[PDB]
């Protein structure tokens, strides 16, 4: 019993099923303080007593299943928080189906992945600090003016005088 409890209590599946059970009140919101509360939580979440889990053979067949069965066919696109609730509940239901190797699973997984991608697009819309572009007043868009170097073929008179000698700018004129 101790080894079984230690193994299952450290399974993230158990914690996720326990959270789902806590949402609708099947188990107390506080973690167990006494062994009786732990046994009750195990019975509610896993669905089988630890003594009878060692006797029979399945494990995933009777894990909690949320009480409220909302309609996930409105996931086909007070509405937005309900959509978030539907996303959470369908994620739990699909994860539980994945554990149980339920038939007709990959197509529903892809459909819910598309739904959650749309929901993630909305959530990313909620997660924007903003953006600004310094517009060039002469134009109507992002500034292109720069102080970069621009090549230009200067006249040869700048380097050599009328007698072909190079310039030596070495006299300072002060006014």
């Amino acid at each position: 019993t101790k080894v079984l409890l230690t193994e299952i209590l450290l399974d993230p599946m158990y914690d996720y099923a326990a959270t789902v059970a806590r949402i609708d009140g099947s188990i107390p919101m506080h973690k167990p303080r006494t062994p009786k509360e732990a046994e009750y939580e195990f019975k509610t979440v896993i669905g089988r007593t630890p003594a009878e889990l060692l006797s029979q053979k399945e494990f995933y067949d009777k894990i909690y299943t949320s009480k409220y069965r909302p309609d996930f066919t409105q996931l086909t696109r007070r509405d937005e928080e309900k959509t978030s609730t539907l996303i959470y509940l369908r994620a739990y239901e699909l994860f539980l189906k994945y554990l149980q190797n339920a038939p007709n699973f990959n197509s529903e997984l892809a459909e819910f992945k598309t739904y959650e991608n749309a929901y993630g697009e909305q959530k990313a819309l909620l997660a924007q600090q903003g953006f600004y572009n310094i517009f060039d007043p002469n134009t109507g868009r992002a500034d292109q003016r720069t102080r970069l170097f621009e090549y230009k073929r200067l006249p040869i008179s700048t380097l050599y005088d009328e007698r072909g000698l190079p310039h030596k700018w070495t006299i300072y004129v002060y006014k």
Binding site: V3, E7, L10, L54, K57, A91, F95
Partner: protein
Amino acid sequence: LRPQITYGPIETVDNEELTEADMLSFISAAVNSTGLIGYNIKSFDDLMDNGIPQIVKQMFNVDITYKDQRDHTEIDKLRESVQIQFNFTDVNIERPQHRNYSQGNKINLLPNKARLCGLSYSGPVNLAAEVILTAHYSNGRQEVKRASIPPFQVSTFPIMRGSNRCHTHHLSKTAKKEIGEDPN
């Protein structure tokens, strides 16, 4: 074959209105198509589905001959070598599994449990084979015994997280978030 498609003349393309900040969309598109580490997942995926099966089924055919080091017998004294010949036919790799309690039925092993318990996120490898043993006699004839072996699990191969053989691949982002994984 010669190319046949033709595009619009380059003199009609209007790009005088472009800005450098507009060209960041090209980098955005390139990263979105590429991803950031998508090559790692693709490489592990075609190692699983295509690489290891090919390596096992092609590059590990065994053909050896060994001396018969037995004692004296009618057949014994008259034979000198035995040829061991075998190859692997069927190869596959499954998702990581863990045995709950003792003598269970190999429930799934999530990555967070492997991290916490110090376990190995490795998936079983199942192989099938056919074996041929050929024994050579002194006179010149030989005897051949052939046997086909049902598929069996030899060991477990490490599984990259997020690949096709990972459990965090048949799960949604919310489920990934709530099982102790990083959804992002």
